[PDB]
Amino acid sequence: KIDFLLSVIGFAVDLANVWRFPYLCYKNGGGAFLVPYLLFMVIAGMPLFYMELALGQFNREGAAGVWKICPILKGVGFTVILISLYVGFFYNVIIAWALHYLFSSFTTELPWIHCNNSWNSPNCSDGTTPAAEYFERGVLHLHQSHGIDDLGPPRWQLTACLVLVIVLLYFSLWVWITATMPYVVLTALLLRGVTLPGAIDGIRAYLSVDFYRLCEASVWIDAATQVCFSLGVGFGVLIAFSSYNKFTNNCYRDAIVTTSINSLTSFSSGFVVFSFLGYMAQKHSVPIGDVAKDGPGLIFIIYPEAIATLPLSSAWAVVFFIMLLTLGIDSAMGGMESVITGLIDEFQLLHRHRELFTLFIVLATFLLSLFCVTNGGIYVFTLLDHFAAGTSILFGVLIEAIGVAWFYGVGQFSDDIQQMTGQRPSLYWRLCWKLVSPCFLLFVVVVSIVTFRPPHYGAYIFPDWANALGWVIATSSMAMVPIYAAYKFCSLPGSFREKLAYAIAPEKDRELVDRGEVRQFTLRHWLKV
Numbered sequence: 001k002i003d004f005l006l007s008v009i010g011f012a013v014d015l016a017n018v019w020r021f022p023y024l025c026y027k028n029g030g031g032a033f034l035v036p037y038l039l040f041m042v043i044a045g046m047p048l049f050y051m052e053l054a055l056g057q058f059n060r061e062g063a064a065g066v067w068k069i070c071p072i073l074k075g076v077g078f079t080v081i082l083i084s085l086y087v088g089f090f091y092n093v094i095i096a097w098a099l100h101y102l103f104s105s106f107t108t109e110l111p112w113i114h115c116n117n118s119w120n121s122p123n124c125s126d127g128t129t130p131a132a133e134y135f136e137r138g139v140l141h142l143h144q145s146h147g148i149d150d151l152g153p154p155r156w157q158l159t160a161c162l163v164l165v166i167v168l169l170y171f172s173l174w175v176w177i178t179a180t181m182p183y184v185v186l187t188a189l190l191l192r193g194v195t196l197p198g199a200i201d202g203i204r205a206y207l208s209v210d211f212y213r214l215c216e217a218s219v220w221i222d223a224a225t226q227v228c229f230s231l232g233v234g235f236g237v238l239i240a241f242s243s244y245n246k247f248t249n250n251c252y253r254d255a256i257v258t259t260s261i262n263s264l265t266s267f268s269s270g271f272v273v274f275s276f277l278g279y280m281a282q283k284h285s286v287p288i289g290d291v292a293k294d295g296p297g298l299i300f301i302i303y304p305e306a307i308a309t310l311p312l313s314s315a316w317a318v319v320f321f322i323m324l325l326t327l328g329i330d331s332a333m334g335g336m337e338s339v340i341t342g343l344i345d346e347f348q349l350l351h352r353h354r355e356l357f358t359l360f361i362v363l364a365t366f367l368l369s370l371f372c373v374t375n376g377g378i379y380v381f382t383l384l385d386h387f388a389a390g391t392s393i394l395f396g397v398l399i400e401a402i403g404v405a406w407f408y409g410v411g412q413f414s415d416d417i418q419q420m421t422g423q424r425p426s427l428y429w430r431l432c433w434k435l436v437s438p439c440f441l442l443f444v445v446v447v448s449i450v451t452f453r454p455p456h457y458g459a460y461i462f463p464d465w466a467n468a469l470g471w472v473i474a475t476s477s478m479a480m481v482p483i484y485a486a487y488k489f490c491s492l493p494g495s496f497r498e499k500l501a502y503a504i505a506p507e508k509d510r511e512l513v514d515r516g517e518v519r520q521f522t523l524r525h526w527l528k529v
């Protein structure tokens with residue numbers, strides 16, 4: 001019972017709930033994003049979470065080793081690894097910024113409190129708030145770069161924190177208070193945020209839906225990607241975590257409670273951020289949509305001010321940034337370990353050379369995250385955030401679902417769940433796995449690909465070659481399935497019929513496929529809801 005609660009809190013609070021969710025909610029209005037989030041969750045997020053947990057807990061193999069039930073669809077095990085690598089590339093600069101802020105927070109007089117220092121412009125209206133000018137001119141030094149075509153050399157101040165983060169990661173890869181401290185910090189912030197004057201107009205703008213923006217596509221794509229980010233599906237960390245789970249563990253109870261608590265925490269985080277946004281908009285005499293830029297650094301401009309308005313701000317800042325640092329370290333470590341374990345288990349060459357491989361991969365991710373700590377590192381961060389997950393994560397999840405359901409059998413999957421746990425899935429889960437979820441994922445993928453929506457940062461407009469590069473990096477991960485499928489199809493001996501038979505039949509039918517027995521060579525298998 002106690003062990004169950006601690007595991008539940010593990011998937012409840014994460015870096016995607018605290019950092020990404022308020023940013024995405026501010027981008028799309030506040031309620032016009034709340035509605036699609038719940039709609040997509042209760043239909044396509046929980047069924048896939050329960051699905052992935054059950055598949056991992058039954059196969060007891062690695063991220064790419066669970067595809068012995070459909071050999072042809074095995075490149076989706078490398079697509080998720082590439083997606084995890086791309087995400088972990090920019091998951092490090094968040095920790096670097098948190099470390100920089102924590103090191104700069106050890107002073108009785110915080111620097112993000114007035115515009116009188118060297119890095120200030122005569123446009124401050126303590127115009128631009130002091131916190132935003134501090135973040136954009138004394139931490140990033142973004143005003144010295146024209147754009148993504150002129151990045152300059154990396155800053156040594158942020159490199160001296162990236163090195164520490166990398167070393168800590170490697171030496172942790174080569175806790176009761178950890179999981180519960182964010183709850184206390186968030187509650188203590190929420191009390192002050194609600195009690196603050198002028199926050200009711202920041203809560204009303206949060207609990208209100210505009211039908212005009214519901215007829216767009218960007219909101220739906222953002223909600224679809226955010227569900228995957230928050231729940232954790234599509235990265236392969238769920239299968240890796242469930243590989244060493246108890247074989248008799250109940251799954252529906254583990255899938256309902258985690259989703260419920262994750263939704264509650266996301267709602268609370270958005271509530272706090274929008275209440276403080278309303279208070280700041282009231283104080284600075286600006287509209288709510290004007291007081292900040294909808295960029296990836298919203299919580300580094302909003303939360304320092306909230307800490308400042310709070311009595312004895314130094315201790316509160318230290319505690320908040322320690323909490324954020326631990327959250328980010330755990331989030332990066334999870335994906336890093338997932339990639340390491342998957343690549344180690346897939347290939348037999350790297351059996352004993354584990355330390356060398358881990359050191360080289362850590363060195364590679366450091367050398368490739370070095371790009372985001374230059375002058376114009378926010379532009380590269382925005383490109384990576386827009387294109388790393390994008391449509392590729394939805395494509396991978398959709399392919400995985402189509403594979404395990406249609407190619408294998410929802411009846412066979414339910415039979416395996418019956419053998420594993422006590423009960424059998426009802427009709428709702430079977431229908432969601434069979435038709436409802438893919439019919440939404442395919443639509444989301446098509447809509448995301450068709451629409452233009454070029455990336456931007458405030459008034460800046462990205463050029464054409466940046467979009468071409470982003471599409472290249474997205475397709476690089478997306479196109480690992482067809483190449484492996486072609487290689488496996490050409491590798492199998494026999495004729496075309498035999499090649500397809502051994503490519504699509506489960507590997508547990510080894511002694512039966514030879515004896516003229518192919519279950520997939522019919523129509524009754526496919527017409528089984």
Ligand SMILES: *[C@@H]1O[C@H](CO)[C@@H](O)[C@H](O)[C@H]1NC(C)=O
Binds near residue numbers: 116117
């Ligand atoms: C601001 O800097 C100027 C120049 O040194 C001077 O007025 C004073 O040192 C500072 N004043 C405040 C209120 O910070």
Ligand SMILES: *[C@@H]1O[C@H](CO)[C@@H](O)[C@H](O)[C@H]1NC(C)=O
Binds near residue numbers: 122123
């Ligand atoms: C700051 O004020 C100057 C003075 O006119 C103006 O030229 C400049 O555009 C302002 N900065 C921004 C970011 O608008």
